[PDB]
Amino acid sequence: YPQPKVLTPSRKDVLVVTPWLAPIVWEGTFNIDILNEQFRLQNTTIGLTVFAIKKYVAFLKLFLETAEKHFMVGHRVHYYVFTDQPAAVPRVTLGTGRQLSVLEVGMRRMEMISDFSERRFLSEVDYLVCVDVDMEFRDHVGVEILTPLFGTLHPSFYGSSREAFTYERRPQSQAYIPKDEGDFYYMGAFFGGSVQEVQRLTRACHQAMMVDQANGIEAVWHDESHLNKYLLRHKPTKVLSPEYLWDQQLLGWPAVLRKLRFTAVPKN
Amino acid sequence: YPQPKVLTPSRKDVLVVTPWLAPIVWEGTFNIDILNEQFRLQNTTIGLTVFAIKKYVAFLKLFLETAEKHFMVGHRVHYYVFTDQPAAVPRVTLGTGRQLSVLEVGMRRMEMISDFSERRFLSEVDYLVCVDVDMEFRDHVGVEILTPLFGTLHPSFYGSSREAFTYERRPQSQAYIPKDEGDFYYMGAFFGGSVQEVQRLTRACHQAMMVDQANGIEAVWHDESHLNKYLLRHKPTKVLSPEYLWDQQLLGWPAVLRKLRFTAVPKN
Ligand SMILES: CCCCCCO[C@@H]1O[C@H](CO)[C@H](O)[C@H](O)[C@H]1O[C@@H]1O[C@@H](C)[C@@H](O)[C@@H](O)[C@@H]1O
Ligand SMILES: CCCCCCO[C@@H]1O[C@H](CO)[C@H](O)[C@H](O)[C@H]1O[C@@H]1O[C@@H](C)[C@@H](O)[C@@H](O)[C@@H]1O
Ligand SMILES: O=c1ccn([C@@H]2O[C@H](COP(=O)(O)OP(=O)(O)O)[C@@H](O)[C@H]2O)c(=O)[nH]1
Ligand SMILES: O=c1ccn([C@@H]2O[C@H](COP(=O)(O)OP(=O)(O)O)[C@@H](O)[C@H]2O)c(=O)[nH]1
Ligand SMILES: [Mn+2]
Ligand SMILES: [Mn+2]
């Protein structure tokens, strides 16, 4: 493969590493051939959780069809589809080494991911990735994201200063973040990590949300506000650029995005 | 601390992340206040190995005096000084939480670090850093380097193409690297990692060197050639820039170096 170029920046228009030395994953920062080898040598298995409750079962067909074309191709994958309507889950044909399980349901997502992430039947699974369903894959989402703990830059806020971030601002909430604190604003629609780090994150967020509930407060952006509090205090080991959570109808195709990899499906 | 700036590159003149997403550590890529907190929360202890055999015991006084001013200040440190002359080890006054042990000696370094890294008295030690003694610290060398496995870009080769790297080129040597392979040329004077990853690296290099010896071959740059073979196949999780291993008499103070942190002491 090509030799890296010590004296040539991978990017001149964006930040590619956080101040705590976690890579920020953009196109042009990684050679997927090297990463795919490293992760295949460990026979890595990726679990993907996705919730499709009530009308949102309609989003599953395109979500799964496009995941098969773009998500972790060549690696072992297990989809876990959480739904109140198991018969509505479309029968999509999967590539080899890929499986799908339907978990009937029934704070919902963090509580349910926490309970599920503690089950022994995940012994085989190495990483969990937790995403919204009202989305489609348009380009590669692969093992470059995998790491002990990651969050994703929210596509509306990546250029914002921290006072503009919509963190929970009331001190009476467990999700509270002061106006002079905060590294980034992370989207609740795409986070993940090793099974252990996802257990810890979802347990912390669910236990925080139960405290707030006992106290009669609901954080401003619900589990996303608790996710931001958690990732402020437990800094992620990679941060995904907005390539990985984009809304093209809202935000177009800016010059800093070389690829739109996982994008919102327009809805009401 | 200051908010990171998503739309401003940490560096426009150099590569700050490798193609396998390991940070390349330069000045301006890290906020040491954040890292120091993360590592103090784990009560991290760093061991430093250094060999001073025959005339090279003369380099210990400045090496230790300057390590006390610049190496891992505020963290727990244990120096392990390997020498054939324990009485020649200078009695340098250490800061709090820092200790020094003298190990009398007697392939020497990788064999001796391998044996030593397997001893139970390292139970307390979290990372090992392995350096040459003919050096002095001139500026901060701290927990920004710590990671499971690191190597350091050799200051003569960081701008070179891989065919110019002085890898072992004879296929009959265990250190052999083909002309079209290689990411960087690493210096044998500064590598390290977690205790486990240093055990693995020094065992592999020592076992490789014993194979070559049985076969009547000595690799071109001895343990440095085996270190490069190892780090080609087991890629480091951080790479230190030449800030961390510099020769100012040879190479001056180029524009791409913002700090000269650990530098060669001129010798015969
Ligand atoms: C017409 C909607 C414009 C909203 C832009 C800001 O996005 C929203 O940001 C809040 C936090 O301030 C939440 O993260 C919320 O989930 C975001 O909205 C969703 O994501 C954006 C990118 C867009 O796809 C919206 O349609 C979604 O509802
Ligand atoms: C006058 C010496 C010029 C040598 C420059 C190249 O450095 C040497 O590189 C070889 C591999 O090609 C080895 O890594 C060797 O240890 C290097 O020499 C040492 O390091 C350089 C930076 C300089 O300090 C020399 O005086 C050292 O002997
Ligand atoms: O009626 C609903 C509402 C939400 N969701 C799940 O919760 C996620 C977040 O909601 P939305 O996607 O409604 O939030 P935005 O992403 O517009 O905040 C959805 O992607 C689904 O995975 C669902 O399954 N049914
Ligand atoms: O006579 C010697 C030769 C080498 N060394 C150790 O081996 C390292 C590498 O040798 P040098 O530093 O001689 O190599 P260059 O760094 O010039 O290759 C030295 O820093 C010492 O730590 C030593 O202790 N005594
Ligand atoms: Mn959504
Ligand atoms: Mn030396």
Side-chain angles (χ1 to χ4, degrees), chain A residues 51-53 56 109 132-134 267:
Chain A
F51 288 69
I53 305 297
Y56 280 58
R109 300 190 292 177
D132 274 22
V133 72
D134 58 324
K267 59 178 193 299

Side-chain angles (χ1 to χ4, degrees), chain A residues 237-255:
Chain A
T237 52
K238 293 184 176 163
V239 175
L240 312 190
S241 68
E243 300 167 351
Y244 291 88
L245 202 66
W246 194 254
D247 186 330
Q248 187 181 14
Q249 171 187 59
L250 188 74
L251 301 166
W253 192 332

Side-chain angles (χ1 to χ4, degrees), chain B residues 56 132 134-135 154-157 164-167 185-189 220-222 224-225 228 245-251 263-268:
Chain B
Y56 280 58
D132 274 22
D134 58 324
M135 305 293 296
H154 187 129
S156 296
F157 295 100
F165 299 167
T166 58
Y167 293 150
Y185 193 75
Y186 305 100
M187 193 145 201
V220 62
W221 287 103
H222 312 107
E224 178 172 281
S225 294
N228 272 281
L245 202 66
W246 194 254
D247 186 330
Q248 187 181 14
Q249 171 187 59
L250 188 74
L251 301 166
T263 57
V265 175
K267 59 178 193 299
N268 267 283

Side-chain angles (χ1 to χ4, degrees), chain A residues 61 64-69 79 90-96 98-100:
Chain A
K61 182 170 185 287
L64 289 172
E65 285 170 351
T66 62
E68 286 296 301
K69 290 182 167 80
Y79 302 106
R91 291 166 300 113
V92 172
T93 303
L94 305 185
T96 187
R98 304 176 69 99
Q99 184 167 340
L100 182 144

